[PDB]
Design a protein around this ligand. Structure first.
Ligand SMILES: CC(=O)[C@@H](O)[C@H](CO)N[C@@H](Cc1ccc(O)cc1)C(=O)O
Length: 309
């Protein structure tokens, strides 16, 4: 039949994605059955675009703001690790074109303002970080990548200002009760490990140790509640889009987690790390670990960009 050509194209795309999959690493996991499951979830969503001879569109909520802990990152502004990551995502769409002529697009849905309050990061800085990321997309020629922000939705408040109000509106319309978020979080080991990870990152950036513990635990549920709301919003806007994610994700999930630079931490993202050249390969690592390595900082455009070891 005529499906063999279509089924060939979709499977080449899925196989390329699988090369970059972000997942909880555990050697007791059968990887072969995991991939078999992912095939059953994503191949239909992929073929929807191929049948209609439409470019494959991907959603990725990512790059909200730079982490404020200087022990983790180099500067408030986006750095090489962000640049490498954008360059990678764009070139990922570019090669789909050789297999498929329409090619693909990735909408980066920057979640910066949605949880800005809970990160204790100025909306002014988040807006600045977003602006620079659009500027990096032009610097690099990332013609397949585009940006979606809370400001963009017509339904949520018109104004960029009163982001607080935008946050309130998003939570009322698209959020879920924190108790539901916590209850759901505590069924899976998927949800368990998300909760742990998000608390850890919130703790680290915040350095009265107990008040600091219980607070990170409470803010974590908050930040997850906001981010799932954001996803709900995206889930309505771009329903047939393939859902990329910056977090590990179970194989049955609709979301597909993805890496953008080499790293040994499944939870690391370039806005929580720096770029290190070791043995001719750039890697994503926390700022402090590189300093222990003794690698020397390299500054481009004046602002520090990366560390070379
Ligand atoms: C479920 C989530 O919403 C998070 O996982 C989130 C996704 O965007 N990434 C971060 C959160 C974070 C980001 C910027 C910052 O300055 C501080 C914290 C994380 O993993 O901890």
């Amino acid at each position: 039949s005529e499906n063999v050509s279509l089924n060939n194209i979709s499977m080449q795309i899925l196989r390329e994605l699988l090369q970059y999959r972000r997942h909880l690493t555990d050697p007791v996991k059968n990887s072969a059955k995991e991939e078999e499951i992912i095939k059953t979830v994503q191949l239909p969503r992929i073929e929807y675009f191929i049948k209609n001879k439409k470019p494959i569109e991907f959603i990725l909520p990512a790059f909200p703001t730079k982490s404020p802990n200087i022990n983790k990152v180099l500067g408030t502004a986006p750095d090489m690790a962000e640049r490498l990551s954008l360059i990678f995502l764009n070139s990922f769409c570019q090669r789909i074109q050789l297999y498929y002529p329409p090619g693909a697009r990735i909408i980066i849905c920057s979640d910066g303002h949605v949880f800005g309050d809970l990160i204790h990061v100025s909306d002014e800085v988040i807006s600045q970080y977003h602006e620079d990321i659009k500027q990096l997309l032009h610097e690099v020629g990332a013609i397949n990548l585009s940006t979606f922000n809370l400001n963009d939705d017509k339904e949520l408040c018109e104004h960029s200002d009163d982001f607080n109000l935008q946050r309130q509106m998003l939570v009322k319309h698209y959020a879920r009760s924190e108790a539901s978020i916590k209850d759901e979080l505590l069924q899976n080991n998927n949800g368990l490990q998300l909760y742990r990870a998000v608390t850890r990152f919130l703790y680290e950036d915040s350095l009265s140790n107990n008040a600091l513990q219980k607070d990170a635990k409470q803010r974590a549920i908050g930040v997850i509640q906001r981010s799932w709301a954001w996803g709900s919003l995206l889930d309505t806007h771009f329903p047939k889009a393939i859902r990329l994610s910056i977090h590990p994700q179970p194989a049955d999930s609709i979301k597909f987690g993805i890496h953008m630079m080499p790293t040994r931490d499944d939870w690391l993202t370039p806005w929580h790390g720096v770029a290190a050249n070791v043995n001719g390969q750039f890697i994503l690592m926390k700022h402090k670990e590189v300093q222990m390595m003794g690698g020397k900082l390299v500054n481009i455009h004046g602002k520090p960009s990366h560390y070379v070891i």
